[PDB]
Amino acid sequence: PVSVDGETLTVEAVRRVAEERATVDVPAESIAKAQKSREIFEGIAEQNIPIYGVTTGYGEMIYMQVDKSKEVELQTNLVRSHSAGVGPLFAEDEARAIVAARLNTLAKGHSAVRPIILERLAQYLNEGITPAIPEIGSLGDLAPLSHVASTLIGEGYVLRDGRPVETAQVLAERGIEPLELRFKEGLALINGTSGMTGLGSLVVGRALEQAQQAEIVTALLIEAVRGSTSPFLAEGHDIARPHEGQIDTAANMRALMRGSGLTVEHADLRRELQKDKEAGKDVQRSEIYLQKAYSLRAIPQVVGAVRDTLYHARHKLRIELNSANDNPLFFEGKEIFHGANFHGQPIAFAMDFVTIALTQLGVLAERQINRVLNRHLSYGLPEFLVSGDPGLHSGFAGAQYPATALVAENRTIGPASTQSVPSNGDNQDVVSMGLISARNARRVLSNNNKILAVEYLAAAQAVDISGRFDGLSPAAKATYEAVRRLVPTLGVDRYMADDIELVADALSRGEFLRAIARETDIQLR
Amino acid sequence: PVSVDGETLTVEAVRRVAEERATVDVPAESIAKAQKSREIFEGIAEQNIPIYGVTTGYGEMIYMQVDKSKEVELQTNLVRSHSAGVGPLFAEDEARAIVAARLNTLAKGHSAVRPIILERLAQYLNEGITPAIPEIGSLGDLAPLSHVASTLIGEGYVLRDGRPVETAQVLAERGIEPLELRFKEGLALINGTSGMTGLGSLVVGRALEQAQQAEIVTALLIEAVRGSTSPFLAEGHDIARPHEGQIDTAANMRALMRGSGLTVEHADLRRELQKDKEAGKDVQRSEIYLQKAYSLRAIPQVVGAVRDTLYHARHKLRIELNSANDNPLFFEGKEIFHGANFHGQPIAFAMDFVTIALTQLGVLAERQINRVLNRHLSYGLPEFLVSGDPGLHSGFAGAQYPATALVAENRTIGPASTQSVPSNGDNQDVVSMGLISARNARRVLSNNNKILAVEYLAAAQAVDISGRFDGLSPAAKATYEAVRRLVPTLGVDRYMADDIELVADALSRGEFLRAIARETDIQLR
Amino acid sequence: VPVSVDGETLTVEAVRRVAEERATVDVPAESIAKAQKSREIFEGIAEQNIPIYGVTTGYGEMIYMQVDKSKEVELQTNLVRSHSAGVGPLFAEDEARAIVAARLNTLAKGHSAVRPIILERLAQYLNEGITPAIPEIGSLGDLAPLSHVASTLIGEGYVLRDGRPVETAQVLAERGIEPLELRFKEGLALINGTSGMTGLGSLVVGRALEQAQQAEIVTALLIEAVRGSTSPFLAEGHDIARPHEGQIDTAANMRALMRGSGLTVEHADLRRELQKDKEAGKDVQRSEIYLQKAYSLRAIPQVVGAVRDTLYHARHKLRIELNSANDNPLFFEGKEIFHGANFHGQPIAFAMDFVTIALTQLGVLAERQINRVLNRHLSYGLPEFLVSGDPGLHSGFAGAQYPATALVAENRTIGPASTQSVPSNGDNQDVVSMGLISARNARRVLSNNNKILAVEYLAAAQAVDISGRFDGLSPAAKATYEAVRRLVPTLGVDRYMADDIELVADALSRGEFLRAIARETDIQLR
């Protein structure tokens, strides 16, 4: 059971709830400190004092003073008039991630909403009622959250088997009476960064597994090509260049290739090469490379940088998930706080950063593909991994194209956290566009699975084309089995698409890294 | 019947074939000049002389010499090994546009393919057999076209009711015997810019109607706000600044507002304002604006620039549609041409340009929305077009958000025609990425319908909130009726999403501009 | 010599002549007469205190402020002063001249209602070398830049000399010129246009075309050094198969450039050589001969053609803008004052964003051709990285490739500007073009490409002597080579390259290589 207390929620906890449909539970302490705030706040609204969103207009119309007899109407008109989202609907797991992040915010107890709101949100999550949330509309997350707030009052639509069906039917069809929004209940449900923070959570969490899976195949590839282990020696990171991420990647690469009979140690290389030099010449030509190319050597540096960015992103997400990103806010014997904790800038940046990081992750992946496919760079393999007669057969030559195309496509994605456009009169003169940032990262993450899919296939192909299967380390054989369990070796050439999408979906499921855990005890960082 | 002769095909012709399922016909002259080339070429391949793609490997493996006894195998392995496309599948109309562009290329008669290939392509089009083409893979269009070439040989998949179903079943299920690829038939089917040129055609064609529809609502808006006609007077464009597009927009704006009882002439404004000035003061404050803001005045300039870009794009598309974008090429008593007319740079640029143009089109649209929604800029209308008690009701305040978000999202889309990444060894060291460019433009075009949808609704709303319906010109009333026929006036506020998507889909169908044609005889440029 | 600025026939080339080579400018008597007459009629209407934007009303959002004609000079003068708020680097002499030239031509069209004296002053400044100190930043597309120019017209602001800004007043006294006094609508007319982006973009587009030519020139030399196929440039493959204007031109320049080459090979020879290399026995055999070459040496017409097309479009747009009444409000005899927005630089803003993209790709192509010759696996028989002595010990051009590769990456970080409108001035300027930013972006890629091309010219020339293929070069290729070798010596032992590269880059920025061909061959390049 995932505890949603607005204090200890983690990115992984969110994923379990969103992807694995884990049960959520609001702690009595949270549900209790929520009723209290609600009790005091409610006594404050009875005195018809000025409170944004409770007894005033919304946004620029805050100058419009509204009397307390319009309690339910105000909150409702808001939710209905802001449910103006467009574009595609978020997937079931994405929608759940969003609802979880909102509940956790209210569960912190500073939103002064009735306990039943937290309860009802937790019910939808625990009962499988997913709001149909359109992806576009948020300026960083009113509209997306307005469609959520709708389902609670029996309006809008829910996501049933891929399509949106009126909340009304679904609710009555489940024996649930829609709620009625009281003072500041409508505003609290839609006033925050739950859309970007929810989606962001799923993306960063998955981004991390993609780095681990990038490491896994990169490892298989280095063994199949007989690369040097020198680049990953602890002294070069832990001691010489202590970037957290770099150390982690270097550590995973050493563990993944551990016990390989194909990789070479610097000592052996240096000795093999020295044995190849004649002493009567000042400058000789050797066919041996003491170091391999950047793509098979600078892995710790590049992927480590990626990790560092994903670590910083998860950090900001963790802080945000457990924050009172709502407005206005309530405290003990303190004036009602009128700020802007609904501003997603901290996450908008975080995700724009993740987009850049992941894009470089893909760049690196695609070049390794290029490296194994080019006969002048493969270090001994046949052109484009062709088994039979090259020319007549192209092998993986055609498979490289979609991977190269994706690197270019990912590069056309620009940062969104700086594209603020003034609206609502000029009240919202500076916004973050964070949900666009989150969606950008999601896309590059998705495209990276396709690039990686091509790499996983090329590697396995290079393995049984060089006949180096029996030399692969335990983790290397684990990865190889996992690919063949899905796609067989490439004899004559054939329709590639199905094979790529097959390995791609598996990658998005963490099928690899899951195979390493189940067939070793490599504990991957 | 649309004539596909590789010489006279137009962008609109393509749309009719793609969107309206118009019948296609290959002229006897084309089918005849095709058999001839085929006859001579075939006698050239019999002598087992070096011919790229016919008796050699593909791409970098061109050094692999292949004997003529491998005729069918070569072309086949190619189509199968390059069908490595990923991502979503193109829509039925997009796929048809692509097939049409390919057929038209071969119909030019320089590809030396058997007439039956042109015939079979024309059959799929005329019979409703649409190839399931994945959107990603092309480096600018092998993979996308490889999935097409597949269906002709009974492999791959076809697009049936939204999903991909094996070509085999569908073919046998229609009484069609799959073809067998001969010398250079596989290469010719996949070696060109048909993907980007096909999709590009649909996008530019629709882009032009979007400009016309931007003009239509912009016109309704200018009448509803009582704007000045001065900005559109012919002297200011035809004479002072003769940019083709600017003249066209200025001309459409004069025709659209024609006979309006709400707009003001400069003479009247100047007179009204002069009447408002006291003669005893050197500098007075007036509540009258002799000119309106840029968004309601610089329409000819901005939209005209858009038009110019779309005119140049259509031009390049027209030239390309009718070109032999295939390789190698055949001529009369001339060596076999070995060039690179498969390089989509001319279209890659054209579409990157369209992306920028359309993005500015949206920028302008959204600001007009902002203008009508802000009480300090509306020129007399209520805040956010609220009918009842503002504050209590937000009116269109929430509807502005998705439009503002879209301008920002469109801005995150970067040019693709410059993101070339070297592949296939280094044989393809400079590519165009044109299909990504086409897809970029498509997206901004799609987002523009949503922005425009919000504007069309705001305008109609501003009309019956100011009670200026009886003053609207004939075209203005035409547009207004068309909006209300879909969405009623906004009394109390309510769920906006359905209304926006409703006007959005209509916009993508050209429902407006169709209404102007049917309810006037405004001939819009 | 002298160029005629009649607001009707000015060309991008004429603008460059006035700007780059100090060509004398001359406003025709017909234009002066149209100006004098428009001014007299316009004056007669402004003299009646009727409302006219910027003449008897406030500016921008403050148009609601009605101003009496008794304030005629002050109004125009406060405008030019308060709007001279540009920041950043000052444009060079040639850029500032093109700007003033474009402004003079606009007013010379006759619909600005300016006194002929202003037309006279601007032309005086140009013909006498009085260059305004124009800050690059600060226009939204071009008030700030033009206001700094208008300033020097009234003895204020700064003039540029020796690269430093010098108080205008001093300069005018040191030349006998007496400052003007802005009258009705004169301050507004001087700053309310697209002269900033239009003048600058003209220089850029003109140079972009010369850069296209010089790219074709070096590409032709390279193709001959590595003995590529002439087949990709056969007329029938463009003029007939794919008639894209720019594509036809490039294909033609390449054919003219390689005419008379003993190094290039024809498709016929290739296949014959390839068939005699084939042995009747095996079905699939390996050959070391390439019937076709990499895209970088075969898709030149398609790619450079596209760049050309884009440039032809921008030059066309620029030509119309140069001869346009991009000002507001406007006077048309027998008509009410035109109140519009011809000051909006969207059309040019777009054009320049396109040139930036186009030139960026031109640079990508050059970059990969450099890579082509430096890679022993792709150079077709040349030594690694063009090392003449012992490799490893010497790197040759290994390091020269980096500044070029690094520049391709930099050009790709430059995004379109024409779509970046930010509402200002009380939402009155709610949609702008940022065209001058677009034009400076283009200038930047242009500038960067000269560096990429410089490394390519050095590499090609080096590839020639390393392979001892000088005697087989066509007439044009020998000219190109000697032009390079006249600046930089062949690369023997490794040496400092930075100076060798900046030397050829400068030669490229001034059309040196395009001139070598004009003076050494009978070739006419498109």
Ligand SMILES: *N[C@H](c1ccc(OC)cc1)C(F)(F)C(=O)O
């Ligand atoms: N997020 C609030 C908001 C809600 C709805 C709206 O459209 C009318 C504009 C703003 C807020 F006003 F920004 C706030 O809580 O501060």
Ligand SMILES: *N[C@H](c1ccc(OC)cc1)C(F)(F)C(=O)O
């Ligand atoms: N477009 C050709 C091509 C096809 C397939 C391929 O992958 C092996 C690489 C290239 C071409 F070789 F580029 C050509 O026709 O020139």
Ligand SMILES: *N[C@H](c1ccc(OC)cc1)C(F)(F)C(=O)O
């Ligand atoms: N270009 C005019 C302008 C001048 C100065 C200014 O800043 C106050 C704003 C605008 C114009 F108002 F745009 C015009 O001539 O229409």
